[PDB]
Every structure is written in C-alpha cells, then in structure tokens.
Amino acid sequence: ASRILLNNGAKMPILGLGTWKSPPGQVTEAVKVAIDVGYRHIDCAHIYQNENEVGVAIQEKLREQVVKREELFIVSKLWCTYHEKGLVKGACQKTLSDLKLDYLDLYLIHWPTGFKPGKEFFPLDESGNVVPSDTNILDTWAAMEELVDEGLVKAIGISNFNHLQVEMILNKPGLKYKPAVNQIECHPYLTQEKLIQYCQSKGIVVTAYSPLGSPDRPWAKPEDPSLLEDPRIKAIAAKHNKTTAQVLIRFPMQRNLVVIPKSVTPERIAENFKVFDFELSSQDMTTLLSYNRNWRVCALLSCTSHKDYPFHEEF
Ligand SMILES: NC(=O)c1ccc[n+]([C@@H]2O[C@H](COP(=O)([O-])OP(=O)(O)OC[C@H]3O[C@@H](n4cnc5c(N)ncnc54)[C@H](OP(=O)(O)O)[C@@H]3O)[C@@H](O)[C@H]2O)c1
Numbered sequence: 001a002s003r004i005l006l007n008n009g010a011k012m013p014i015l016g017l018g019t020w021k022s023p024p025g026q027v028t029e030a031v032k033v034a035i036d037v038g039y040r041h042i043d044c045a046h047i048y049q050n051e052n053e054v055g056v057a058i059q060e061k062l063r064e065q066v067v068k069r070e071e072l073f074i075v076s077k078l079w080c081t082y083h084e085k086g087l088v089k090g091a092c093q094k095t096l097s098d099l100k101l102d103y104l105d106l107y108l109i110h111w112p113t114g115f116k117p118g119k120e121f122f123p124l125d126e127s128g129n130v131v132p133s134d135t136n137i138l139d140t141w142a143a144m145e146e147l148v149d150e151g152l153v154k155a156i157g158i159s160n161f162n163h164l165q166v167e168m169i170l171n172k173p174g175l176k177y178k179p180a181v182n183q184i185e186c187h188p189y190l191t192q193e194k195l196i197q198y199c200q201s202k203g204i205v206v207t208a209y210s211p212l213g214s215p216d217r218p219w220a221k222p223e224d225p226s227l228l229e230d231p232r233i234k235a236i237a238a239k240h241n242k243t244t245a246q247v248l249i250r251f252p253m254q255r256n257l258v259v260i261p262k263s264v265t266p267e268r269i270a271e272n273f274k275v276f277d278f279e280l281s282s283q284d285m286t287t288l289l290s291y292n293r294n295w296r297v298c299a300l301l302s303c304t305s306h307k308d309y310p311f312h313e314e315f
C-alpha cells in the first residue's frame with residue numbers, strides 16, 4: 001500500500017522525494033522525472049532555497065496533464081527564524097508563492113528551536129553560538145494551527161522534536177490540531193526505536209529523513225560511517241538482487257514509516273522508487289536494526305545551548 005492515513009483524514013504517500021541540496025539547476029528536472037516515474041510526495045523547505053524551482057516543475061506537469069494537484073502531497077517547513085507568531089503566516093505564504101500552490105498538504109515546524117528573526121538563516125554571535133529567539137514551542141504551534149483554519153495547509157506537524165517536546169504539544173490546553181507527522185532522522189545507524197514507538201502510540205506518523213545517510217551532507221568527514229558503502233547492507237541487497245539504496249528505502253517502509261530519499265540523478269530517482277516489488281525478511285529487518293549507533297547526520301553543534309535543543313534527551 002502506497003499511502004498512510006493521517007489524523008486529518010488525508011492519505012500521505014509513504015515514498016517521497018527529498019530536495020535538500022538539490023541545486024535549482026537540477027531540482028526542476030528531478031521533480032519532473034520523479035513525477036513521471038510515480039512520485040507523488042515531495043518534501044520541501046524554505047531553507048532549501050529551491051522552492052521556486054520545485055514549483056516550476058509541479059506547475060508544468062499539471063499543465064502537461066500528467067497529474068492533478070489532488071494527487072500530489074506537497075510538504076514544506078517553517079524555518080527557525082520565523083517562530084514568532086506574527087511571522088508564521090508570512091513564511092507559509094512565501095513558500096506557497098514560490099511553490100506556485102494555493103495550499104500545502106503538510107507544513108512542519110522544521111526544528112523546535114526558534115532563532116533570532118532577521119535575514120540571516122543561521123544567526124550567530126561573534127563567537128559562533130546560534131542566537132536564539134524568545135519564542136516557545138506552544139505559541140509557535142498555535143500559529144501553525146491558524147494556517148489550517150485559514151485553509152493554507154491541510155495538516156501540520158513537527159520535525160526533530162523529542163518525545164517530551166511532542167508531549168508539550170499533545171498536552172496543550174486548548175489544543176486545536178494534534179500534530180499529524182513528526183519528521184526525524186532515521187536509518188540503520190540511528191534507528192529511533194523509542195521515539196518511533198512513542199509517536200506511533202499517539203497516532204502520529206513518522207517520516208524518516210536522510211535514509212541513505214546523507215552522503216552529500218556538507219559537513220561530512222571521511223572517517224564517518226557510510227551506509228551506502230556498508231558491506232553488510234551491500235550483502236543484504238545482493239541477496240535480494242536490489243541496490244543498497246533500495247534496501248535502505250524499503251527498511252523504513254516496513255516499519256510503517258514514510259521515507260524521503262533525495263536525488264537529482266534521473267537514473268537514481270527511478271531506481272529509488274522501485275521498492276514496492278520486494279520484501280526484506282524478518283532476519284534482514286532484525287539485522288538492519290542491530291546496526292544502530294546513535295549517529296546523526298543532522299545535529300548542528302552551534303545550537304546545543306538552545307533551551308529547546310532536542311537531542312539532550314534520550315529520545
Ligand atoms: N526535517 C529535516 O530537518 C530534514 C533534515 C535532513 C533531510 N531532510 C529531508 O530528507 C531528504 C533526504 O535526506 P538527505 O537529503 O539528507 O539524504 P539521503 O536521501 O539520505 O541521501 C541523498 C544522497 O544520496 C545520493 N543517492 C540517492 N539515491 C542514490 C542511489 N540510488 N544510489 C547511490 N546514491 C544515491 C544522492 O546523490 P544525487 O542526488 O547526487 O543522486 C545524495 O548525495 C532531504 O533531501 C530533505 O528533503 C529533512
């Protein structure tokens with residue numbers, strides 16, 4: 001089955017296309033190809049600074065009558081510099097304008113940390129610390145709720161929230177919408193068992209990002225572990241006559257997760273979608289979960305003093 005039921009009654013495709021680090025010079029082509037081979041879910045963000053070019057590709061394929069808007073599941077995220085309640089609608093509408101859409105299927109608080117408002121996306125002080133804003137999770141969530149009620153977005157959720165942060169929202173007195181999705185890093189080196197169990201037990205759908213271990217993350221170090229190059233995973237893949245990437249994508253699908261692998265290479269975009277024709281065994285699943293090492297590609301150290309830094313907590 002290709003989609004998962006959200007708590008707003010909408011269905012979300014469990015396989016989507018990631019766009020972080022896709023240059024504007026290629027994401028337009030990536031999205032056109034992805035739509036052509038079956039992708040219906042695109043994961044976007046203002047901070048990826050390519051939303052216009054994603055937009056160009058969606059609009060053209062609608063025009064080309066390849067797909068209808070209702071068939072598409074378009075996701076974007078509120079960046080940290082816009083957590084002030086007065087700044088949220090504006091940030092959402094900028095994304096909508098860039099994407100040439102009149103609604104988003106899902107809009108996420110990108111990170112639980114608010115940053116000092118301004119032009120700069122990562123404001124740092126003279127000594128390299130991120131400059132926080134005096135905003136809090138709940139007031140930001142309230143502002144996300146207004147976007148639903150104004151029809152700009154069909155569902156709202158969070159990303160990179162620990163279970164206590166998620167709980168803050170669930171337990172909010174006067175809560176209008178429960179989060180639909182929590183999008184978190186997840187792969188065989190960071191298996192997220194406790195956070196996944198929590199979220200699923202609250203009927204919050206989990207999206208796994210960086211499922212291939214983000215080998216193009218800009219701060220990669222040669223000594224870092226490399227999922228696509230792990231000979232153990234390569235061995236599972238060889239056994240199924242699939243690539244290592246296909247195995248890494250299928251793995252979260254069998255944990256009832258949504259997964260959003262990124263590529264701008266047309267051959268890989270196609271390859272990555274071809275994962276509904278095979279099953280990983282119970283042993284394969286057990287084996288892949290045993291590789292957990294609590295290793296994160298996304299965890300900017302200049303943020304570790306923010307009051308809302310999410311990764312001090314065990315989960
Ligand atoms: N919520 C958040 O905080 C957050 C954080 C990080 C990521 N995400 C989202 O999750 C998406 C996926 O994560 P990610 O971009 O970090 O990394 P990823 O999807 O784990 O890996 C993308 C890297 O894998 C390569 N790749 C893709 N398919 C391949 C294949 N079949 N064989 C070999 N290499 C392949 C890509 O190369 P080419 O593109 O050059 O083909 C690129 O270098 C992002 O794009 C973004 O949409 C969200």
Ligand SMILES: O=C(O)Cc1nn(Cc2nc3cc(C(F)(F)F)ccc3s2)c(=O)c2ccccc12
Pocket residue numbers: 020045047048080110111112113160297298299300303304306308309310311
């Ligand atoms: O954001 C993307 O989608 C990918 C992403 N991840 N990271 C690593 C980060 N680590 C963080 C940690 C916190 C923290 F909450 F923990 F404080 C807050 C914010 C961040 S950004 C980046 O630095 C980044 C820069 C530009 C575009 C995308 C990204």
